[PDB]
Subunit: 317 residues, 6 copies
């Protein structure tokens, strides 16, 4: 289990995103749910998986009562996705300076069907991340020493020895997919690179639903340089052959949506235009019928000159 | 399709709950999620499936802009449940007087796996409920003339002609079963009878997770006469042959948790499965049975009253 | 001086609106401003001229301290309009039960230019409305027996004997006209008829600026029958001889702006000045006429309903 | 067009106030109004002219949608005063770091009478301040290269190429006046110098109305030094000959109003007492009958030992 | 023990106020303080003695958890007063419907000095009020059949059988007198009659300190007929022989303080002690008498109405 | 009168607490009340004695109107305790930077019985702390040059020459006590030393009542070191001989109450166990019957491994 410091978050993201095409599979934004837990006295376990960063001044996180008599506190979380292989994750103890979780370990298990709610007592649990030490009010970026778990997993269990507080818990993993949305996160797609993110993130583009407001989308500052543009490179969770339609949803972007957009395709060198410059409108699902055969592995959305987009869909085989 | 007036809700349930063994398969509490919609100008589409009763003042409901160019507005909702057969539902237009939905019609569709977010266009959409008329600020309890739909669906589509507002949308259906939690709502269990429901319904007993607070559970009024007790009759999604674990969870109930609880089983005459046991607060109570019985309906008894969050029943057959 | 009961508001308007062509010349919405007052101990004098109806709970009104040493309390208000002849007004004592104004009397005055803030002392103050009696928590609609005052004024003074509270003070008067906006309230135009007023009155159509939000405009209920339309009949401050520009402004109406609008002219039989045109949201619609017509009353028609912020009509004569 | 930095605001105020006797003639505090504008999506154009300084955390200013297709956005503001000559002004882009207006130019025009609402299209518009560049989150103090415009103006137009945000817009100008209030701002009077201002400003003394609270008055910290005093030198908008009465209004100053006051007069060298030490009371209009003939150009109010005053009036010829 | 219905409150007071000369000796306003309690799970025990009437929504009252193992829940309250004899009180179960206190009983105890906080256990606790039954959301005005208790107490104990909620608990008793303030509540004075009580009762006149705001005083409605006056008849804790100072305190009454006040004395025919004097706001009015009179009941007269905070009367005997 | 700086607060506390066994006898937390005052215009005199530290952004303190004509402003405060000897105190002018009280002096007086409310005019007042200078926004720790006043006192009077603001006023004094609670503050007990205080203070343990929430108790951070503990040494206000029972109340500490506690006794050298390790529960009054004879002067409560306690009682002779 190698650790990373804020100083090298760049490298950490590289090991996680670019090299292992993984995502925070327990995040609520994508479907993650809290199945159970041992205690939740000062702050709810649900706080652990929210998309927003921890706020202060009540605590934004999971804090249990004091003096646990059990060897550890715990929580069981079900991935939003069908299953995935784990590479690493984050444990943020933000604003918990002292009463933070002293040590933490993670376990996983695979449950064929939604037969019921998993119990912490289940015999299928398996250690995914050996016990390690946490520091106060900080982020712990960690990767498994051997990398991607060779087994598939559906539920994960966080353990805090013996109790305390954790602000956020992120667990990155390679989605094991179930005509389909090739750029859908639940199908294995992930956001790779991007010009910039002001609010929201490029990985919001590959999510379920149209969202609730502009916060769950991808937005970029108001630029001024001529010929300026913004872009996001998504790696479809499965190389295409036939792309029927590409959808660019600007839902909730009413006064800051892009002026034009263009989509391109690349195969694991040259980029090919799939949807040339197209004037876009506010809060709409602009649908582009491609009906073309191409072997693309990556898609690139370009916002011009900048703006906000909620989602991008790429239906095909 | 028959409609029921408020003074007939008693019979309405009879049709959907006792007879058809249905439950609200699109509500959030259970996993219902908005996939998309044509517009949400004045009020968010997600409000539709909330578990709370509409609240006044912003509008606690769904509302599109005026003068729709298309023939109707729509919202696409994915079932929380794995699949279900439909019988009817509720369309509450609360607090929308005049600008309420003139007409509504419902369509269902069956999609195998989360390939992506279904589109209005999809040629699999079929009419499940013929277009009927809505009135100002009221509830519309309806049931399909032909009872349950022979087919089973995973997503439903609501159509409002041509635009306006709907406060709530409940769609009732019989869940299709995917050791298993035999009382778990996802496996087809439903609550038929209850002695009392002061706060939170009895159908909360059979849901995923442990919830957020006392509101997603079952709570009865405070009683005074000796020997008084409250109960909930639950129909297992399948008859049992063997039962290993029964779990009564009082999570979140700290000052009003029941004093003692018992669990009796029946085949449709009652047999004791769990003898009178003193319960505690915000705790999971695990009772080992290791016995074999052919019970179909279970009955939780809390004494003298109080609240319980969940009841699990692990068995076979 | 005659008074009208609520069940007579219908006739009240007839007298002031249709007959005398008056408008509330001291309200803030139109430019009314408090110049000074003798006291505002419990509630601000500025509340008097607000466009909203009194709201309960602080007191939404004007209230002076108890036991006034002088004979009466007073407030001096300057007309928004350039000058006007008075017919009557409203004195709403809403929510002031018992400590309401026992008596009230009104005085007017004509001051050329903004030399400074007029004083109570000024020897130009003349009685326009004889001292009458007010009752607890109610509205007092009154009209001068001698109709319009032969003279024209710029400031008015309200006297409360000897102290107490008044929720609202409306003073109706016929504006004195200073290419010109012939429908502009400052030039003497007034709205006589309207098919409907769900939110915001039709007299908002003829005001300065584009307003703040949807509240300072005209909005009609959402309609359902085909071919339904809503309208507003406006009397120009002067008959036209030539009309160059007509402008329909829907500023702030983004989801309920009208679909199409038309403008007909009449001389007091209607003539089309602006043919059916599709309108947009939060936009100014400029229609060139370059024609000559002797119209006195204009009529805006929005289809099928919705809201409009302003209507301008530039002409001659 | 010479610019000034916060470092030399002192000199800027000198060029504007002392040398050109000008005031912020479009300020709402004095009567400035927003007539129209091109867009107002993120923040209202009315925010531009409010008396208070820009606050943060919604934006306190004027921000338009993105990617304007028109060459520039704009707003038309009507001065509170009858007319004035312009010398300069301020453009604050506070808290707009990046999305601020890249460039700005100002235009003016004179409209004989309130014939209607001016259109940005009017042919009378005249460039008053050539296009210049703005920086992020900062104040831009600017003066016209040639100084006071030889022409009179009533409306001014701010243009933002092509869109963005401006926090505040101040436009200083010499008021062209219409027995009168010689110290009335609408008559050309201006606050020249002053010992100090804690809350509110000395220029609040020459405003219309009695105000709403202590914020629109002039207040000084609680001093302790013996024989300490505070003063404000106003320059009447017109040399006097006969001063009938001087009014000192302490409206809204109930616990921090001055203990004594004295008024003096000077002619453009020696100061002459007009109202000697006079014990003052709370929330009152202390009226001093002078009935004296004097050629004063400047008036000086002295607060002892300190305190709060709402307004000072000086009636005469 | 007799109970009185609301339509009998008139008689209730007669018994406790005029006859027995009692006052609410446990309310906070007067010094009542919670010493301890068995439980406060859903609602704080301190709410019981608040001077305000119960307010809805949290619960404005006292509420213990469900299923008490002991026979009853309890709260221990220490009298503000030095000691008192009990006659009866009020038990308001407002807003507690069903989960209200089934039964209640009261016990008193006399402890010399503040040795510590009394315990439920203490063998000095004696029954003062036999266990009676309470109903849902209502007031219970009761009086002891045997009138005043022969003994005097310092602390009282409320017992709720077995658990539930009580909104308010008033306990009436005749205070035991420890130059002295002869009208001071702690010396046994009580208010018998008043002409009017619009805001705040007359018994506030005789309390410790000057209070917090206008709410802890006596305020009468605004009157209109000439010569109208309001009064309060107060019974001194002892007859006077000599009276040196009378003090009328209008602290906090700034805009509704009385205009003039007078004070007459009587022996139980009235004699003037303080002649008509003009009163001021938020000020203490000290009137020297230096005379000897055998008065027992004093009478404060405010003209024409208004509010007064306190009335002190220093004398001998 | 020697002063102390924040730098030597440690020494100041030593002179006050350890050497003179004194406490803040006018604090509201212990019973202190405001009897009267000269003015309270900007901020209530009651703010002076609240237990919490001064907050900002209305002012948290006592601020009077400006320009007092009287030689000084003042306030009369009654100690919560029966009487005490004074050693020193604190005057905090927090957040009052400039308008703070320039000078201050303190007076005291003894009133046999609660005969009435003391007047600032009383002849018994005695100078306890000669007039001294205060600085802006700071704490003034001061001790009487000669120390403990040889006389007993019940009321104290703060004087501010001539007016301004004081944030807090603390007056430490040795309590003159009235089977009893030997560790009760009202009996002369005081908190001496302690391992640490996170929230609340160790001196909260010796207070009246059970409190309102966790803020009026003694709590320590969540520790992690093995064998870690927390303790508080109380000095009984009177050496014991027979200790009947010791009570440890953990009221309001539900999730952070200690796991075990032990009480010890010492005589003015060796510590003796009085209550050995005892598992403690939440929100309960753990009662320990000692029924032992011992000459202890000091008591020591030990929290293990840490936690929160509301009060400790020690009944005996």
């Amino acid at each position: 289990m190698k650790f990373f410091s804020l100083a090298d978050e760049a490298e950490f993201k590289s090991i996680i995103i670019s090299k292992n095409k993984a995502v925070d599979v327990i995040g609520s934004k994508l479907g993650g749910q809290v199945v159970s837990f041992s205690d939740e006295w000062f702050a709810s376990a649900e706080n652990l998986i929210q998309p927003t960063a921890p706020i202060r001044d009540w605590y934004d996180g999971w804090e249990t009562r004091r003096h646990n008599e059990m060897e550890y506190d715990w929580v069981i979380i079900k991935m939003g996705v069908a299953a995935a292989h784990i590479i690493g994750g984050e444990i943020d103890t933000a604003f918990f300076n002292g009463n933070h979780a002293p040590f933490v370990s993670i376990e996983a298990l695979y449950d064929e069907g939604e037969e019921g709610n998993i119990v912490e007592d289940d015999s299928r649990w398996v250690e995914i991340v050996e016990k390690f030490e946490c520091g106060p009010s900080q982020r712990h970026l960690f990767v498994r020493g051997n990398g991607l778990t060779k087994e598939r997993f559906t539920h994960i269990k966080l353990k805090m020895y013996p109790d305390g507080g954790i602000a956020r818990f992120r667990l990155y993993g390679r989605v094991v997919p179930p005509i389909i949305d090739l750029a859908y996160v639940c199908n294995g797609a992930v956001a790779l690179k991007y010009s910039d993110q002001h609010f929201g993130s490029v990985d919001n583009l590959l999510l379920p639903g149209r969202g609730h407001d502009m916060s769950d989308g991808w937005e970029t500052k108001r630029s001024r340089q001529p010929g300026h543009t913004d872009w996001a490179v998504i790696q479809l969770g499965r190389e295409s052959s036939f792309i029927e339609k590409i959808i660019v949803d600007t839902a909730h972007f009413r006064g800051n949506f892009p002026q034009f957009i263009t989509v391109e395709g690349c195969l694991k060198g040259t980029w090919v235009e799939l949807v040339g410059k197209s004037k876009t409108g506010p809060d709409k699902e602009h649908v582009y019928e491609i009906r073309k055969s191409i072997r693309v592995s990556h898609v690139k959305l370009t916002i011009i000159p900048d703006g906000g987009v909620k989602r991008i869909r790429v239906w095909g085989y």
